[PDB]
Amino acid sequence: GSHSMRYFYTAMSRPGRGEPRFIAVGYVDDTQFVRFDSDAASPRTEPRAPWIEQEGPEYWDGETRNMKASAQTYRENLRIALRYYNQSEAGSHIIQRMYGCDLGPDGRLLRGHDQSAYDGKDYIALNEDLSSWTAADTAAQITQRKWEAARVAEQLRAYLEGLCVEWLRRYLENGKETLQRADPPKTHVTHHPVSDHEATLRCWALGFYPAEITLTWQRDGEDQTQDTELVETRPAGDRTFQKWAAVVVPSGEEQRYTCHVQHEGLPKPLTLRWEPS
Amino acid sequence: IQRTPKIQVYSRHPAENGKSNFLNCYVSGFHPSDIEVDLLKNGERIEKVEHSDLSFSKDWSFYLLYYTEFTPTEKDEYACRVNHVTLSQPKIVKWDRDM
Amino acid sequence: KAGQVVTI
């Protein structure tokens, strides 16, 4: 099906505790494959998935040089942001960036992304046209004016439509045994009384990849959206994910409830119920 | 401007007493990124704990997985202890082998 | 493969 590559950059100032830290991670879909941390003993871009390890020294040296230069540019950007927001040199601040490309099932570029944030709030985003910007506030409008004058969007577009897609396709091929394999959830319903007249039904999904999943409870065939406790999808640590959805139901009515599971690794959506032993 | 962590404590596989496993503490939804996470066994800090590389969600909030290898038993208790600038005191979340 | 970073 569809696939994406995304890089996530975090730059964090820390006055009195040295220069700002820069961390970068790269993902294909929900699989991390590279990392960089300026606080490492010897900062280098490092492999985090087995299928990237085959890349040669030119790859690793080039990515490391890029990340080091990026760290330096973000240190400058943190200083500039102080001027844009009338802020003092004593506070700690964070710039974040996420960017990359999505391919559709056919393998063509579906769309590109490049968004940045300051202190956890939208700052500036490249529009879907890969040609214009959306600035979140008057500071980001200064950046937008600079980037328009310097034709930065054209550079981003060339990367997103070119290198980003070409390298994502390479990674998908080199990692095809895992990146192009969906693992369907293992599912079951548990039952736990809360009292004599109510019980929790919890619908579990375990061991699935990729992370996108839909778990829903129905009562008499009607979705229980506002009555369902849904935990955030969470990583197991073996590449797969876990999730559960729970409802509190009147005792004796358990059989009126059905859990519905949608996942890319399933041929059809599943319906499950509590199965008393 | 600050967001407090969500915390889930769970195992990589369904727990079976005497079978090796991994204990996970997933912290997410927080901002800024500095955070202190310990895994506890019977109230004491586990020394050998690793964590994932810092990343974040589409709403800019950070997430991290802390994890350690362990063999659960009937009586041993485990927990995740988290401190963050948004917390006046560390938050301790006990491992429930059914959550 | 990573892209480039410019000044804000």
Residue numbers in the entry:
A (entry chain A): 1 to 277
B (entry chain B): 1 to 99
C (entry chain C): 1 to 8
Article excerpt on this structure:
We demonstrate here that a Lamin A/C peptide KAGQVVTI which is unable to bind HLA-B*58:01 on its own, is enabled to form a stable peptide-HLA complex only in the presence of allopurinol. Without the C-terminal tryptophan, the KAGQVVTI peptide failed to form peptide-HLA complex efficiently and only a minimal amount of product was detected. Crystal structure analysis reveal that allopurinol non-covalently facilitated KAGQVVTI to adopt an unusual binding conformation, whereby the C-terminal isoleucine does not engage as a PΩ that typically fit deeply in the binding F-pocket. Importantly, the isoleucine of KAGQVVTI and VSFIEFVI do not engage the F-pocket to take the place of the missing tryptophan. In contrast, the extended confirmation of 8mer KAGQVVTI peptide causes the middle part of peptide to be buried deeper in the peptide binding groove. The P4-Gln residue forms hydrogen bonds with Arg97 on β sheet and Gln155 on α2 helix. P5-Val interacts with Ser70 on α1 helix. P6-Val forms hydrogen bonds with Asn77 on α1 helix and Trp147 on α2 helix. Moreover, the P5-Val residue also interacts with Thr73 on α1 helix via one water molecule. Therefore the re-oriented conformation of the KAGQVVTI peptide enables additional hydrogen bond interactions at P4-P6 that stabilized an otherwise unconventional binding without a PΩ anchor.
Allopurinol, widely used in gout treatment, is the most common cause of severe cutaneous adverse drug reactions. The risk of developing such life-threatening reactions is increased particularly for HLA-B*58:01 positive individuals. Despite the known pharmacogenetic association, the precise mode of interaction between allopurinol and HLA-B*58:01 remains unknown. Taken together, this data demonstrates that allopurinol, and to a lesser extent oxypurinol, may enable the loading of unconventional peptides that are normally suboptimal in forming stable peptide-HLA-B*58:01 complexes.
